[PDB]
Design a protein around this ligand. Structure first.
Ligand SMILES: *[C@H](C)[C@H]1/C(=C/c2[nH]c(/C=C3N=C(/C=C4\NC(=O)C(CC)=C4C)C(C)=C\3CCC(=O)O)c(CCC(=O)O)c2C)NC(=O)[C@@H]1C
Ligand SMILES: *[C@H](C)[C@H]1/C(=C/c2[nH]c(/C=C3N=C(/C=C4\NC(=O)C(CC)=C4C)C(C)=C\3CCC(=O)O)c(CCC(=O)O)c2C)NC(=O)[C@@H]1C
Ligand SMILES: *[C@H](C)[C@H]1/C(=C/c2[nH]c(/C=C3N=C(/C=C4\NC(=O)C(CC)=C4C)C(C)=C\3CCC(=O)O)c(CCC(=O)O)c2C)NC(=O)[C@@H]1C
Ligand SMILES: *[C@H](C)[C@H]1/C(=C/c2[nH]c(/C=C3N=C(/C=C4\NC(=O)C(CC)=C4C)C(C)=C\3CCC(=O)O)c(CCC(=O)O)c2C)NC(=O)[C@@H]1C
Ligand SMILES: *[C@H](C)[C@H]1/C(=C/c2[nH]c(/C=C3N=C(/C=C4\NC(=O)C(CC)=C4C)C(C)=C\3CCC(=O)O)c(CCC(=O)O)c2C)NC(=O)[C@@H]1C
Ligand SMILES: *[C@H](C)[C@H]1/C(=C/c2[nH]c(/C=C3N=C(/C=C4\NC(=O)C(CC)=C4C)C(C)=C\3CCC(=O)O)c(CCC(=O)O)c2C)NC(=O)[C@@H]1C
Ligand SMILES: *[C@H](C)[C@H]1/C(=C/c2[nH]c(/C=C3N=C(/C=C4\NC(=O)C(CC)=C4C)C(C)=C\3CCC(=O)O)c(CCC(=O)O)c2C)NC(=O)[C@@H]1C
Ligand SMILES: CCC1=C(C)/C(=C/C2=NC(=C\c3[nH]c(/C=C4\NC(=O)[C@H](C)[C@H]4CC)c(C)c3CCC(=O)O)/C(CCC(=O)O)=C2C)NC1=O
Lengths: 322, 159, 160, 161, 159, 161, 159, 161, 161
């Protein structure tokens, strides 16, 4: 960072010149200053400085992402407004400027790499750049779509998953480092119970054993947690039934309950006296609630069988206003 | 209603309404005027439909209006007829809506539970609805009757 | 949700009334309008992308927001605002068909001021953007259906 | 939840005191009452559907509530109301066996008033229904059991109101 | 308690208590008076049980009461005896409850973590509980001792 | 409260826009309707006592409500019910002049359900009374005025139910 | 507006609108169209009214646009003119409403407190409004001017 | 309210313990800080109007809030916001003298979030204003005083958010 | 969350200004401190269990809290308290690396007061424990690191109190 600061300082003082040469070059196809008009020219001047100011920031930051997010959509925005080529030609000048300012090859190179990111998006088509997913809903909760650059700006989400591996034996065996296996389990425990249950030093013995071996899935593990004695009494038993279904939303699906009709459907599940079940595993009741959530397509699709549920949040999946 | 259903599917998909979906809406709005007339006819004949259906039901099921039976006594018999009237009103609502959803929310969800607490026999109620259908069909023209029949059938199926 | 047909139904069931002519009149009215509302909706869907872009230009673009230290500033921020303008359009179209305002507030208006205040988004600007969408929409739609289409836009504006 | 036996234990545990004769006497009192309670619970479970029916007949049905524009109008709402009645009955039975009102507070009572107010369910009518159930239950269980049963019903009523 | 456990299972299932569950409650209430006497006996002998068990433990484990060991010194030895007393009180509570749950909440959850911070050896604590069991068994009659033993064994298992 | 004129003003004020022709047209629309509204209001004020009398006769009185055990039994309760009816009428008249339903929400509708539930007043019967008043009012005001009057009455009814 | 004011007085008295009150409402609705024209005139001349009034104010009060004064500097002078524009917009709203209440809620409550924090002199603001009145009066016809004057006077009185 | 000296006393009183050297040391620590705090408080009181002005200039004014459709638009709303700012400043000064955050909890912090949510006042903007006040205050009080002043400002901010 | 470097960047970005040398110097200052911070963090991680043990010994244990009727009485509560202590330590270490107090506000400080009040956990005792941890940490990290470590510990303490 310290030398990166020095690199930034050098770039800062020569920045106005660096911009000028890129601008003089373009002001491929060459476009005259006058036909563009002052405002469009003024914008173009601003834009050059804009790329450069982010570059300085990106140096200090030491991440491609800051430049990455802004450049993506920008290329789409530009086109009717601007020639794609002129923007490119500009960096040709500024990378040459960059090489001149910093005599250390590496110092010029890193500065080049930031400028490379900006260019690489511009080079990539509007189509080549990918639109971010849109969270889907059934008959309630309208479907919301999130922009990708928004998703990129947001800090990456750590996903804990353990995948069952087929064997020659035909009994699944799962390969992970000693720390790595059990880390998924550590986070699962933590998501469902909302705190890590090791500091209390109880956890279902047989649950986790089966997932370590890999025969019952992580999806089936989180199922086993909800049904577990630990999960009630910690949750369920201290709350009224209407509050339990709201917490059970948060930890099992990562969203809050989104509509009146769903909190009603779920309230009837937990309320309903069980149909008598042959499985000694107690029939429905609150267990029904937990089933209905894991068995839900929304659950299975977003998380899949391997992933442990994660909390969807501002960064991911948009998040609704109502 | 038809329109609500279409909008809801679009919103789930997070898309503007498809041409095909739009076409169905167009068809529905054209049908509506005919539907309104069918509904109007049944409303005017409502009093007689209920009366005729009631008599048929009581002939079909002597037991319900018998000392053991739930319907027995003037108060109880009135309530049974009131129920028939309710279902007829729901059917009219359905015809204008073009969907069973209006009917379904008001009358078909929790119906089993309500009647079981009351101890009213569900099959008898179904027979009454069938009876009402027959009376209604006679007053309606054939094509009109077919439209009305669908809604009547749904009710019978639901109970 | 609730649309003009089901609204009339819902008021009648709470009273326990069978449908009266007064009610039948309101229902007829919807069916007359409906045919062109379907036409107007299709127009808005085709030209949506254009409609948004024109609207942004009239108000959102070339504002303090675009300048640094405003919400529009950045590509990321710019993209988000456009999504919000696309949201406002789909709903208003959904509201145009159906013919009941409520679809709007269940899906849009409820909670919006609270999110916007939390995010820092300026409410007034969005209101201006909605009013812009209204003028563009009206031209594409044509004069007869414009009165219809303007209502749903105005509801959104006063909600915010 | 908590039960009478555990309640005594918990009171002693906070004091840190070993169980003493006075404490033992309270436990002994519970043990004698226990047999009666078990019999009462079985009676209630068997007659639960009827109890609800009778109570509804006494207070809820044949009223403005059931008439259009009333809270219990429409099948869906009617079914909801009888479901709530069943909840109250089941929890009261649990409380009677336990010999402690705590479970009612932890599950039924907490947040119900607020929920009902948002919903626009009428609390006083609900309380009326609970009182009606109590009266019906009293008959079936018989006098000794009735006194025990009544306190839990009254506890629910007081909480809601 | 037994009863609490039964109620909780029923509530999870959202059902009234099963006949079998009810029967177990009946058995428990009958057993209770005998259980109360067993608990009373141990309470009276509590002071001596702790003292005797302590001595046995220290003989079994010289190290714990050694300069290196945690128990060493008067203050520390008192604390070790206080812990033994605590566990005995918990056992009495368990016998009257008819379940280990009361014991479990107060003493067995997070016990490992607490002792690890203290650096007290968990196995030595277990030995102390075993020692207490032997003393308690001698004072109790055979059938009473078996009942008491179960609770003592649970504690030993937990640590 | 809000009125049509103020509603237009407020919408412009949040925009910060000076009043424009389109806005003026909306105001102009209201001004034409205004004369009719004033005539309707005067009719209602003069016939208010009778309107209440007729509506009560149609729904409330000669019924179980008035009979002992009914909500409107006893002079005090009877007087309260007719006072409530008058409130609804007066506020609806205010709303009709205003051309906005907001006043009903701000004064009448807010907390009414909860108040009634505590009091034990039957909401559905009250709604019935409001509907009856609407019918009587419709006659007196005449057809053009009736449409305008009806919407406010219906708004009250929907709120309560 | 006039109507809001009348309703509010009636509600306080807990009475239906008086005939006299109703008559005033009738007069107001007739006057409204004329009022709209008066407002329209001022809106069109708004830019010039503000400019002329500003100049007059600055001549009347050299101090405000002086290094000590609040108004001094381009940014500050713009803000002072913006304020004058705001008050003019409020006046137009008032004329159409037929009451000062719309004006009052947006501009006259808490005005003292706001300006005191800003340190803007209240009397100078009043002079600016007076100046705007004179310009506005000239463009308006005499009877129109009198109507407009009342609203302008109220503002001056309020500050 | 409570202060530092009383907080120590209260902790000892619940224990029933006489004051001990460890307790005395905490009291002694406060006494040294005291003189600085008194000077800071006098500075803040004299410059209070300006502090608010500067903080508003930094965050609140020249913003969307002040522009039409913003929360602080209209004189009434503007005046309200500056009144709130004054409250925060006065209470923070009290807290700084006291050496305890409790007064903020008892007076300012309790129910503020709920009030703001009903009003529709934006919490984040308010927090921004508080932070701005802190910065201005920091300058005037000087560095030693600033550290002490900052904690109370941060406490207010954390409570609101 | 936010870090020192990003905080400076964000302030400059809203201004639109390229980074000033004075700003750069602050960033440079952070970069030098970062090496020392990393060493401190490694020390804390290795000695974390002991740090907690020592701090508990200083404040929490041999106290009324651990005695029956005290908040930390029972194994479950004891374990909870030491878990909380570990949280504070881990987050303070994170804050020290970050060079910014914000993470503490975002994760630890937000909702803590409310949680504690519902639980009935005593804040002052918790604060005491945090201060004790700070003292132990100070020793292990050594003087240069201690100053940096102390500020985050103090920040936590001020938030809780
Ligand atoms: C045209 C050949 C030249 C030019 C001028 C120009 N720019 C715009 C519009 C925008 N430019 C930006 C700027 C940025 N936002 C970012 O995140 C980044 C990356 C750091 C930049 C550079 C944006 C967001 C816009 C759109 C809106 C706005 O004005 O802020 C236009 C007009 C197009 C429009 O209005 O949408 C024009 C004419 N830019 C160049 O570099 C070219 C050489
Ligand atoms: C007639 C075909 C059958 C019959 C009817 C019957 N019903 C009741 C009582 C009630 N029935 C209803 C039903 C409805 N309420 C609703 O909201 C709807 C949907 C709109 C329906 C259909 C209700 C609420 C009641 C309860 C009483 C009340 O009005 O408050 C009775 C008498 C009840 C009793 O057992 O005393 C009867 C007899 N019974 C038959 O046997 C016929 C086949
Ligand atoms: C019946 C005696 C009265 C009555 C009941 C009634 N309740 C609802 C709806 C709900 N009831 C609850 C309440 C609970 N939540 C809990 O956790 C518990 C304890 C375990 C209870 C009792 C809830 C959550 C709902 C909402 C669920 C849903 O909407 O389906 C209704 C329906 C109201 C509605 O608008 O849907 C009714 C009718 N109301 C009466 O009229 C009786 C006096
Ligand atoms: C007889 C001396 C006079 C007379 C009486 C009269 N009353 C009515 C109608 C009603 N009177 C009551 C009065 C009461 N209800 C109560 O709750 C109490 C207190 C316990 C009283 C005294 C009511 C409620 C009614 C309304 C109708 C109903 O029954 O619900 C009438 C006829 C109705 C009408 O006026 O059209 C009459 C004639 N009339 C006289 O002139 C005698 C002097
Ligand atoms: C001009 C006649 C005098 C003058 C004006 C002046 N005003 C400001 C700043 C502001 N004035 C306002 C006032 C309003 N906001 C509203 O909402 C309304 C009613 C709709 C009014 C009247 C506001 C809010 C500001 C603050 C800036 C902002 O809005 O962002 C200044 C600048 C003050 C400063 O130093 O910052 C000035 C100069 N000054 C005089 O002395 C003239 C007599
Ligand atoms: C004796 C078998 C062994 C032993 C005992 C020992 N314990 C401590 C200190 C503590 N013991 C506890 C334990 C409990 N608190 C509870 O609430 C319960 C459940 C009811 C228990 C069992 C606690 C909290 C402490 C901390 C001190 C305090 O009481 O405040 C010590 C002291 C050592 C230390 O403090 O680090 C000792 C020696 N250790 C042995 O070596 C024996 C094998
Ligand atoms: C120890 C220094 C003091 C103490 C602690 C104590 N805490 C709890 C329970 C909880 N503590 C928390 C707090 C956090 N959760 C978080 O995520 C964070 C930030 C990362 C914190 C600090 C929570 C949520 C709980 C409840 C969850 C749980 O199961 O523990 C207890 C137990 C209280 C109880 O009776 O349940 C205790 C004892 N109390 C003291 O006596 C010390 C002064
Ligand atoms: C279906 C109804 C609905 C709405 C309306 C809605 C609004 C909405 N706007 C959002 C963000 C946002 N919204 C805007 C919008 C704007 N900024 C401006 O200055 C403009 C005036 C304005 C649009 C033109 C911005 C900039 C963001 C990003 C937040 C930020 O980082 O500043 C987000 C956060 C979601 C995300 O970005 O992940 C929501 C929830 N969501 C919904 O579900």
């Amino acid at each position: 960072g310290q030398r990166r600061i020095a690199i930034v300082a050098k770039l800062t003082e020569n920045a106005e010149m660096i911009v000028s040469r890129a601008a003089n070059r373009i002001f491929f196809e060459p476009i005259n200053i006058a036909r563009y008009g002052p405002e469009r020219m003024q914008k173009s001047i601003r834009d050059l400085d804009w790329f450069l100011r982010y570059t300085t920031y990106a140096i200090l930051a030491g991440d491609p992402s800051i430049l990455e997010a802004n450049c993506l959509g920008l290329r789409e925005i530009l086109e009717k407004s601007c020639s794609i080529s002129a923007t490119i030609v500009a960096l040709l000048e500024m990378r040459k400027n960059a090489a001149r300012l910093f005599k250390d090859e590496a110092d010029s190179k890193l500065v080049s790499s930031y400028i490379s990111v900006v260019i690489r998006a511009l080079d990539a088509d509007r189509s080549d750049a990918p639109a971010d997913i849109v969270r889907p809903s059934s008959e309630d909760r309208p479907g919301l779509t999130l922009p990708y650059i928004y998703k990129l700006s947001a800090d990456s989400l750590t996903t804990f998953k353990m995948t069952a591996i087929y064997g020659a034996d035909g009994r699944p065996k799962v390969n992970l480092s000693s720390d790595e296996k059990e880390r998924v389990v550590r986070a699962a425990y933590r998501q469902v119970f909302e705190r890590d249950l090791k500091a209390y030093g109880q956890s279902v013995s047989e649950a986790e054993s089966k997932v370590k071996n890999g025969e019952i899935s992580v999806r089936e593990f989180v199922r086993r947690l909800g049904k577990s004695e630990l999960y009630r009494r910690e949750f369920y038993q201290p709350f009224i039934n209407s509050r339990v279904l709201e917490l059970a939303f948060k930890h099992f699906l990562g969203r809050a309950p989104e509509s009146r009709a769903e909190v009603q459907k779920y309230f009837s599940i937990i309320s309903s006296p069980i149909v008598r079940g042959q499985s000694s595993m107690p029939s429905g009741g609150l267990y029904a609630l937990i089933d209905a959530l894991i068995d839900s397509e929304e659950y299975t699709s977003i998380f899949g069988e391997d992933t442990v549920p994660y909390l969807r949040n501002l960064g991911v999946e948009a998040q609704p206003s109502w | 209603s038809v329109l609500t259903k279409a909008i809801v599917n679009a919103d789930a998909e997070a898309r503007y309404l498809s041409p095909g979906e739009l076409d169905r809406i167009k068809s529905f709005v054209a049908s509506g005027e005919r539907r309104l007339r069918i509904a109007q006819t049944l409303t005017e004949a409502r009093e007689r439909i209920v009366k005729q259906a009631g008599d048929q039901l009581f002939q079909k099921r002597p037991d319900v209006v018998s000392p053991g039976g739930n319907a027995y006594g003037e108060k109880m018999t009135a309530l049974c007829l009131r129920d028939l009237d309710y279902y007829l009103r729901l059917v009219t609502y359905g015809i204008v809506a073009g969907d069973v959803t209006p009917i379904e929310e008001i009358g078909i969800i929790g119906v089993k539970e309500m009647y079981n607490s009351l101890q009213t026999p569900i099959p008898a109620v179904a027979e009454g609805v069938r009876a009402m259908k027959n009376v209604a069909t006679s007053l309606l023209s054939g094509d009109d009757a077919a439209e009305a029949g669908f809604y009547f059938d749904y009710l019978v199926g639901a109970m | 949700m609730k649309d003009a047909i089901s609204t009339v139904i819902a008021k009648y069931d709470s009273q326990g009334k069978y449908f009266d002519n007064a009610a039948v009149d309101q229902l007829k009215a919807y069916f007359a309008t409906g045919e062109l509302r379907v036409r107007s909706a299709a127009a808005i869907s085709a030209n949506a992308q254009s409609i948004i872009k024109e609207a942004t230009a009239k108000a959102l673009l070339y504002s303090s927001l675009t300048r640094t230290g405003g919400n529009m500033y950045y590509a990321r921020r710019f993209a988000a605002c456009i999504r919000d303008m696309e949201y406002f359009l789909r709903y208003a179209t959904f509201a145009m068909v159906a013919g009941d305002t409520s679809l709007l507030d269940e899906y849009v208006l409820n909670g919006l001021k609270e999110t916007y205040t939390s995010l820092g988004v300026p409410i007034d600007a969005t209101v201006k953007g909605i009013n812009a969408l209204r003028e563009v929409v009206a031209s594409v739609v044509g004069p007869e259906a414009a009165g219809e289409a303007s209502k749903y836009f105005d509801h959104l504006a006063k909600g915010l | 939840m908590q039960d009478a036996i555990t309640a005594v234990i918990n009171n002693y545990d906070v004091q840190g005191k070993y169980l003493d004769g006075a404490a033992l006497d309270k436990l002994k009192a519970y043990f004698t009452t226990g047999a009666v309670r078990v019999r009462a619970a079985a009676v209630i479970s068997s007659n639960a559907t009827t109890i609800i029916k009778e109570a509804a007949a006494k207070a809820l049905i044949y009223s403005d509530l059931t008439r259009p524009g009333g809270n219990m109008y429409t099948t869906r709402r009617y079914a909801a109301c009888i479901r709530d009645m069943d909840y109250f009955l089941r929890y009261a039975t649990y409380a009677m066996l336990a010999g402690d009102p705590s479970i009612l507070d932890e599950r039924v009572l907490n947040g119900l008033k607020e929920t009902y107010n948002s919903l626009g369910v009428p609390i006083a009518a609900t309380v009326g229904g609970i009182q009606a159930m109590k009266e019906v239950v009293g008959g079936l269980v018989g006098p000794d059991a009735a006194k025990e049963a009544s306190i839990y019903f009254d506890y629910l009523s007081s909480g809601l109101s």
